[PDB]
């Protein structure tokens, strides 16, 4: 809980109202009650602010005349919302103290204020930085290094020789450093190629749940600083992702793909390998990415939903589009 | 556990034709069934094949009865009766029995009667487990989460904090309920985390497959209705609401703030956009690309299916250049008219 | 792990040119290789670059040998020899060593010789682990399941009950084998669970990636043939049958009762529908949308690739209206036919 005037100061917001109001948490505009702060981005909500029951509303200067409560004026309410949700965050930590049921190899090095959850398993040679938190049931493999401030939720798997920077956060079920999908072929029999490269994750990387990031075959899989990756993603061996790129849920990447900085990869996209995507590329959802992308901008693919009756005809005609093309050529000749 | 055929038929509300004292030990497919097994016939083309079936009894309809070559249970719906009798004769073990000495259970957790918790499970402070709840080995149940009577988690399931799960649910291994939604604000190209302080509310009789992820809401909640079934490796993003009795097949990826109505059927590998609504009684066939809201019930589909690669190369190129085809068609229409 | 270059060459059936007494400590890429490393060349474009490589030895072909600037191992297939030498020099640790005091192992479990079980792994009643089996930290292996000699599970792998795994398999973390298939009857809109009392049968020399799921069968079994390789994030539904040596790339989804033949190659993120068969020696390129049986070998593809968004918007609109384009074409043909 925090006085509104204090909160406004920390947010660098211009306060219009009673600064002694006590704010206990953040809430949606439709749910907010006394003690909650909320925010608005869409002008459509101006007319019904009299129905919002928040103690304070974050808004812009143009919104201020419509205010029906204490207001914090800022240029970017959504960004301010993020900041104030961090100030008022209620999320617990994955662990506190070192659990006696954890199994920690005698050669592991733990920094100051490290917490390790129940039944977590820490291999030989691991290095955990100051303030690192390892959730219950995690596995951290041999010689892996996790930088200060980083946190794993429960049941995360880190393989061996992995490097993770500072202030990262990895959600449960995720696996970092599994073997890449590397095989030679001897008369139809697959021959495993040991995957002896690593994964290097930079600082401030956030990874969702049940996501897999494979180790490289010889050199490394690299996740740059500030990257955010959603749930259910596959990042194959020797992928390289530039700083601040965002990868939405269910994206599948093939090996040796290089993605630049400030990219936005839409959910359920499929990105083929041994190719590069330059900085500042957006791929919209379900994109089928087969070719290098050399110019910034927004790219898309796919034929979207239709009523089944209509789709049946759409699909048949597209599958026979070569015949259509020939009929059009023939008609052009006759004319 | 074995059961007399008469007693089985009574529990199934079936008409017995044959020896009620036959002892049934389990369910089997028509081709695999041996003595002691009960099986079922849904396809009348097998009527002539019943003499080759070595089951001790066969579930069938009244129209099938003259074709029986064994004890028969006559029902209106052999498939539904199959489901019921497989439940009665289920050999599936429980995820755990009793409370394992290797489980780590906070002193403030509230355990109901007949709760079982498997080896090395971890139960946080304030957790409430209702009567007959079973937690598999290696599970994690985060702070203050509540699991209703009769619900069961297989091994290695992760439940985060402040999650609510109703009664008689079943969650398969690897599933994660309540991870942070994918919430970030952008500040001059840098991502700023938005804490996800909503929850997940899961209703009664919900079944969730393996390695599915259901993220907690940003402020308000992610909600799964009663009787919902969700297959493996789905992503249900923050603030999705799924209406009662909807089915979601495997590998479906949903964006945030999608609302799905009751009695929908979402085919495997579909992709669904967010901040929009799908009404009740919508079916999306497999791999559906659902970009826009669906306001009318019925069946919807997308996608161009497989062709020989040589063919596909031309199909793809011609489609990508379809605007040129369109212009040539218009130009030819003007030339002819 | 260090080995003399002459002995490595003998084990690789390679022709040594250079100092057999050189000590090789590991494999490295051509760009990263340093003293003590062996590397390989598959692209002759790098012949002029070999003077810049600091490896102690380079695997190459007879045609490459005159361009060597180091000890050389001459072989017919440098890529295959790389795979073999990376195995000889593998630095990958084992998932576990010996039996961890924190593992919870049912008294009725049967262990072969030289079995290792990692910390906090849980082994149910009736489980059988063959010789040299390694169970990683935190795994679960359910009742009566059998894991054959030489097979290894990384950490946090889940095996359900009555599962059979062959010899020399490798399963990466987060994978779940034997969960319930998606089986339900329907009583007036209410789903009625069908217990899934079939199993999963996995053959010998199967490799499975991370966070992959393979459901048990409803009555009959889900079957994975010998020598199959399966990538991360795959979904193999109940009663799927996969033939020997087939390869499944990452993110593939297979629906129930699909039968795939031998020596198939399924590209990443493909979607294969069920109750149908794919014959031997079929390749489905990535993101393939497989709706019908495939009865002939060869390569099959689907999908319209990426375009600039503004271009895609027009493409999609025209395709969605392609039936009107068809009707206009037929109408125009009729006019040119003078009818
Ligand atoms: C719940 C039920 C008893 C009935 C049902 O409707 C259904 C079931 N299993 C499915 N598997 N796949 C699938 C899985 C992976 C890839 C491709 C397809 C579907 O699409 C499935 C569907 C549906 C079909 C159309 C809408 S939902 C079993
Ligand atoms: C098994 C092998 C040694 C050889 C192989 O054939 C193969 C391999 N890795 C792949 N990754 N992806 C992929 C992954 C994610 C997104 C898109 C594509 C494929 O499609 C892959 C394929 C195949 C190509 C065509 C059919 S299978 C390595
Ligand atoms: C599906 C998961 O998608 C996300 C998850 C988290 C964050 C952003 C996205 N995301 N990515 N692309 C889009 S989309 O609107 O271009 C889109 C295009 C086509 C379809 C069928 C859906 C969505 C969204 N909403
Ligand atoms: Mg323990
Ligand atoms: Mg997918």
Q: What does the DSSP assignment read for A251-300?
A: -EE-TT-EE-TT-EE-TT-EE-SS-EE-SSEEE-TT-EE-S-B-S-EEEE
CATH 3.40.1390.10 domain residues, chain C: 1-98
Strand partners, C3: C24
Residues 25-44 of B with CB under 8 A from A: none
C241: Cβ contacts below 8 Å, ≥ 6 apart = C222, C223, C225, C258, C259, C260
For C143, how many CA atoms within 13 A lie in the half-sphere containing its CB?
A: 10
Q: Cα–Cα distances in Å, from A188 out to A183, A184, C262?
A: 11, 9, 10
CA atoms within 13 A on the CB side of C102: 27
Homologous superfamily (CATH) for B99-337? Hexapeptide repeat proteins (2.160.10.10)
A202: Cβ contacts below 8 Å, ≥ 6 apart = A165, A223, A224, A225, A226, A227, A243
| CA A63 to centroid of chain Cα atoms | 31
Mutate to test the pocket of ligand 1, among C180, C182, C195 (most ligand atoms within 8 A of CB): C182
Residues of chain C in contact with residue B306, where contact means CB-CB under 8 angstroms, are: 284, 288-292, 294, 300-302
Angle between helix C322-336 and helix B322-336 axes, rounded to 10 deg: 30
Mutate to test the pocket of ligand 1, among B232, B266, B286, B305 (most ligand atoms within 8 A of CB): B286
The strand ranges marked E within B2-132 are 3-4, 15-17, 23-24, 26-27, 37-40, 57-60, 71-74, 104-105, 110-111, 116-117, 122-123, 128-129
Q: Is C120 near ligand 2, meaning CB less than 6 Å away?
A: no
Give the closest of B90, B137, B268 to C255, CB-based. B268
Chain A partners of C338 at a C-beta cutoff of 8 Å? Answer: none
In 10 A of CB B113, how many CB atoms?
A: 9
Fold of C99-339: UDP N-Acetylglucosamine Acyltransferase; domain 1 (2.160.10)
Distance (Å, whole) CA C220 – CA B72: 23
What three-state secondary structure class fits A221?
A: strand
Q: Which residues of B touch A325 (CB under 8 A)?
A: 318, 325
Residues of chain A with CATH 2.160.10.10: 98-335
Residues 241-280 of chain A with CB under 8 A from chain B are 244, 246, 248-250, 262, 267-268
Helix A308-319, helix A321-334: angle, nearest 10 = 60
User: Residue C136, Cα to own-chain centre: how many angstroms?
Assistant: 19
Nearest CA among C275, C181, C194 for reference residue C221: C181
Structural Rg of chain B based on CA atoms: 26
**Burial class of residue B51, CB neighbours in 10 A (0-12, 13-18, 19+):** exposed
A1-97 falls under which CATH superfamily?
Answer: MurE/MurF, N-terminal domain (3.40.1390.10)
Cα–Cα distances (Å) from B298 to B203, B250, B266, C273, in that order, read 25, 20, 12, 21
Chain B residues within an 8 Å CB radius of C219: 27-29, 32
Measured from the Cβ of residue C17, the count of other Cβ atoms closer than 10 Å reads 18
Out of A175, A193, A291, the one facing C83 most closely (by C-beta) is A193
Measured CA to CA in angstroms, residue A153 lies from B214, C137, C238, C298 at distances of 15, 17, 31, 45
For residue C330, give the 3-state DSSP assignment: helix
- C1-98 to CATH, choices 3.30.360.10, 3.40.50.300, 1.20.1250.20, 3.40.1390.10: 3.40.1390.10
**Where do the CATH 2.160.10.10 domains begin and end in chain B?**
99-337
Beta strands in B194-331 (DSSP E): 200-202, 207-208, 213-214, 222-224, 229-230, 235-236, 241-242, 247-248, 253-254, 258-260, 265-266, 271-272, 276-278, 282-284, 289-290, 298-301, 307-308
- Does the distance separating the beta carbons of C80 and A184 come in below 8 Å? yes
C273 Cβ below 6 A of ligand 1: yes
Tell me the β-bridge partners of A39: A58
Q: What string of DSSP letters covers A25-64?
A: EE--TTT--TTEEEE--SGGGGGGTTT---SEEEE-TTTG
The class that CATH gives domain A98-335 is mainly beta
- Is C275 labeled as catalytic in the residue annotation? no
What is the spatial distance between Cα C219 and Cα A176, in angstroms, rounded to a whole number?
35
Nearest alpha-carbon partner for C176 in C152, C153, C146: C153
CATH 2.160.10.10 domain residues, chain C: 99-339
Indicate the residue of C92, C306, C326 with minimum beta-carbon distance to A299.
C306
């Amino acid at each position: 809980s925090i006085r509104l005037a204090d909160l406004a100061q920390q947010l660098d917001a211009e306060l219009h109202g009673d600064g002694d109001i006590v704010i206990t948490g953040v809430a949606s505009m439709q749910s907010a009650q006394t003690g909650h702060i909320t925010f608005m981005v869409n002008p459509k909500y101006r007319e019904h602010l009299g129905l919002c029951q928040a103690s304070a509303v974050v808004m812009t200067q143009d919104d201020l005349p419509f205010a029906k409560s204490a207001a914090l004026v800022v240029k970017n309410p959504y960004l301010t919302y993020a900041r104030m949700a961090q100030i008022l965050d209620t999320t617990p930590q994955p662990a506190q103290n070192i659990a006696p049921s954890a199994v920690i190899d005698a050669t592991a090095k733990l920094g100051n204020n490290v917490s390790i959850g129940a039944n977590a398993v820490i291999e030989s040679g691991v290095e955990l930085g100051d303030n690192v938190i390892i959730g219950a049931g995690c596995f951290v493999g041999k010689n892996s290094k996790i930088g200060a401030g980083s946190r794993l939720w429960a049941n995360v798997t880190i393989y061996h020789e992995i490097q993770i920077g500072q202030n990262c956060l990895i959600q449960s079920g995720t696996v970092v450093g599994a073997d890449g999908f590397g095989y030679a072929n001897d008369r139809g029999n697959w021959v495993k190629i040991p995957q002896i490269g690593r994964v290097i994750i930079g600082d401030r990387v956030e990874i969702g749940a049940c996501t897999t990031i494979d180790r490289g075959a010889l050199d490394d899989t690299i996740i740059g600083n500030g990257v955010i990756i959603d749930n259910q993603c596959q990042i194959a061996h020797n992928v390289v992702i530039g700083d601040n790129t965002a990868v939405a849920g269910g994206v599948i990447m093939a090996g040796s793909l290089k993605i630049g900085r400030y990219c936005m990869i839409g959910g359920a996209s499929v990105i083929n390998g041994h190719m590069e995507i330059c900085d500042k590329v957006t791929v919209t959802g379900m994109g089928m990415v087969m070719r290098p992308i050399t110019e910034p901008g927004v790219y898309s693919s796919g034929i979207p939903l239709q009523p089944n009756k209509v789709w049946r005809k759409t699909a048949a005609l597209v599958m026979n589009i070569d015949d259509m093309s020939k009929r059009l050529k023939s008609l052009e000749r006759k004319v």
